Amino acid sequence: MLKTGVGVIRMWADEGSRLSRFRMLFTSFVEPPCTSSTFFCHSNMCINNSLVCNGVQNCAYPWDENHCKEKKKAGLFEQITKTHGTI
Amino acid sequence: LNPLSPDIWMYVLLACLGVSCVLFVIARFSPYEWYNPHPCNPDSDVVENNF
Ligand SMILES: *[C@@H]1O[C@H](CO)[C@@H](O)[C@H](O)[C@H]1NC(C)=O
């Protein structure tokens, strides 16, 4: 968890080990007093609300990827299909 | 309504209207269900179903 607005990542891999890999994911955050255009993952972070239900988790625990995709409740109505709905 | 699936509650009620329609047709098609509701006095062409 960096303290500045500039972060630099390098990868020194020599001749005999060019198969190594890593996939990082940075996320900008401001220390909270959380306001409008903030979300407050509860871990000393205000993140932008574009990062909420982004599909990809951006905080430590997925507080942003929570309470999303809660489609309507169904039952025997949508079970009327190619298999059950013919019977 | 929880101990039976909503597939089953429809299939009972569809069979409840189903067997009711079959038992109505199969009683008119049968000759044995035709008789007289007046057994006291003899026959005067009073042969009558009940269904
Ligand atoms: C949030 O991030 C977007 C980029 O996805 C940026 O354009 C925007 O200015 C930021 N703030 C708000 C309030 O959307």
Swiss-Prot record, chain A:
| Expressed in which tissues | Brain (at protein level).
Report the PTM annotation: N-glycosylated.
Q: Which residues form the LDL-receptor class A domain?
A: 33-69
Q: Which domain of life is it from?
A: Eukaryota
Residues carrying covalently attached carbohydrate according to the record:
N48
Listed as disulfide-bonded, the cysteine pairs are C34-C46, C41-C59, C53-C68
Q: Where in the cell is it found?
A: Membrane
Subunit record text: Interacts with GRIK2 and GRIK3, but neither with AMPA-nor with NMDA-sensitive glutamate receptors.
Relate the protein's function as given in its record: Accessory subunit of neuronal kainate-sensitive glutamate receptors, GRIK2 and GRIK3. Increases kainate-receptor channel activity, slowing the decay kinetics of the receptors, without affecting their expression at the cell surface, and increasing the open probability of the receptor channels. Modulates the agonist sensitivity of kainate receptors. Slows the decay of kainate receptor-mediated excitatory postsynaptic currents (EPSCs), thus directly influencing synaptic transmission.
Name of this protein: Neuropilin and tolloid-like protein 2
Which organism was this protein described from?
A: Rattus norvegicus
Name of encoding gene: Neto2
Q: Which residues of the full protein are shown?
A: 264 to 350 of 525
Curated annotation (Swiss-Prot), chain B:
**Modification after translation:** Sumoylation mediates kainate receptor-mediated endocytosis and regulates synaptic transmission. Sumoylation is enhanced by PIAS3 and desumoylated by SENP1. Ubiquitinated. Ubiquitination regulates the GRIK2 levels at the synapse by leading kainate receptor degradation through proteasome.
Which top-level group of life is the source organism from?
Eukaryota
Q: Which residues cross the membrane?
A: 7-27
Expression sites by tissue: Highest expression is found in the olfactory lobe, piriform cortex, dentate gyrus, hippocampus, granular cell layer of the cerebellum, and in caudate-putamen.
Q: Where in the cell is it found?
A: Cell membrane; Postsynaptic cell membrane
Family, similarity comment: Belongs to the glutamate-gated ion channel (TC 1.A.10.1) family. GRIK2 subfamily.
According to the record's subunit comment, the protein's assembly and interactions are:
Homotetramer and heterotetramer with GRIK5. Tetramers may be formed by the dimerization of dimers. Assembles into a kainate-gated homomeric channel that does not bind AMPA. Can form functional heteromeric receptors with GRIK4 and GRIK5. Can form functional heteromeric receptors with GRIK3. Interacts with DLG4. Interacts with NETO2. Interacts (via C-terminus) with KLHL17 (via kelch repeats); the interaction targets GRIK2 for degradation via ubiquitin-proteasome pathway.
| The protein's role, per its UniProt record | Ionotropic glutamate receptor that functions as a cation-permeable ligand-gated ion channel, gated by L-glutamate and the glutamatergic agonist kainic acid. L-glutamate acts as an excitatory neurotransmitter at many synapses in the central nervous system. Binding of the excitatory neurotransmitter L-glutamate induces a conformation change, leading to the opening of the cation channel, and thereby converts the chemical signal to an electrical impulse. The receptor then desensitizes rapidly and enters a transient inactive state, characterized by the presence of bound agonist. Independent of its ionotropic glutamate receptor activity, acts as a thermoreceptor conferring sensitivity to cold temperatures. Functions in dorsal root ganglion neurons.
Which miscellaneous remark does the UniProt record hold? The postsynaptic actions of Glu are mediated by a variety of receptors that are named according to their selective agonists. This receptor binds domoate > kainate > quisqualate > glutamate. It does not bind AMPA without coexpression with GRIK5.
Q: What is this protein called?
A: Glutamate receptor ionotropic, kainate 2
Q: What's the source species for this entry?
A: Rattus norvegicus
Biological classification of the source? Eukaryota, Metazoa, Chordata, Craniata, Vertebrata
Q: Which gene encodes it?
A: Grik2
